[PDB]
């Protein structure tokens, strides 16, 4: 679990969005596993606008942060799950690092701000949904 809070927006994994997120929907994209909902309170986070390929992510299954080198956002094949059929997920960045399903929502940050959130993983890999291209979040 986990979310980014920026301005009057809450960014979550689309497969983990709540009834309240869908009732206050701003934008969603199943191909990116992202959903953004509106909030009444001002958010605590700021978004990176950069081309960093290194950063640090929070891993809830280890209660720890880990450093990572990650690929540029791209179209990656993701196997079927209880949430989606087998498909290509877009704007996804992969890295070597531990992750389990419940780790989705952990933030990846570089020195400039929030880069994205954990969205996929397996066998020593972790994948992050990029948010740096969503200029309207600011």
Ligand X SMILES: CSc1ccncc1NC(=O)N1CCC[C@H](C(N)=O)C1
Residues classed as catalytic: 15, 33, 104
Which of these, 123, 69, 90, lies nearest to 14 by C-alpha position? 90
Structural contact between residues 43 and 8, judged by C-beta atoms closer than 8 angstroms: yes
> Which of 7, 8, 15, 76 lies at the binding interface for ligand X (CB under 6 A)?
15
By a kind-dependent CB cut-off of 5 to 8 A, residue 134 interacts, out of Zn ion, ligand X, none, with none
State the binding string over 29-68 for ligand X (x if CB under 6 A, else -).
Answer: ----x-----------------------------------
Does 50 count as an annotated binding residue?
A: yes
Structural contact between residues 13 and 21, judged by C-beta atoms closer than 8 angstroms: no
Does 65 count as an annotated binding residue?
A: no
> Residue 55, Cα to own-chain centre: how many angstroms?
14
Is 121 a binding residue for ligand X by CB under 6 A? The answer is yes
Closest residue (Cβ) to ligand X? 121
Cα–Cα dist 24/123, whole Å: 35
Could you give the residue ranges of the DSSP H alpha helices within 12-124? 19-23
Is 124 a binding residue for ligand X by CB under 6 A? The answer is no
The one segment of 21-29, 37-45, 47-55, 119-127 that binds ligand X by CB under 6 A: 119-127
State how far the alpha carbon of 93 is from the alpha carbons of 24, 44, 73, 103, 130, in Å.
28, 24, 5, 15, 7
* Annotation: binding site for Zn(2+): 50, 52, 110, 112
Rule CB under 6 A: which residues touch ligand X?
15, 33, 78, 81, 83-84, 89, 99-101, 103-104, 118-122
């Amino acid at each position: 679990s986990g979310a980014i809070y920026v301005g009057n927006y809450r960014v979550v994994n689309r497969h983990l969005a709540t009834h309240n997120d869908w009732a206050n929907l701003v934008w969603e994209d199943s191909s990116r596993d992202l959903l953004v909902s509106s909030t009444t309170a001002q958010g605590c986070d700021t978004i990176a606008r950069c081309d960093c390929q290194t950063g640090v992510y929070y891993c809830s299954s280890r209660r720890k942060h880990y450093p990572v080198s990650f690929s540029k956002p791209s179209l990656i094949f993701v196997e079927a799950s209880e949430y989606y059929p087998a498909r290509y997920q877009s704007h996804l960045m992969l890295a070597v690092g531990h992750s389990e399903p419940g780790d989705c929502g952990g933030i990846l940050r570089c020195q400039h701000g929030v880069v994205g959130i954990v969205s996929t993983g397996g066998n020593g890999l972790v994948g992050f949904a990029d948010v740096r291209d969503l200029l309207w979040l600011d």
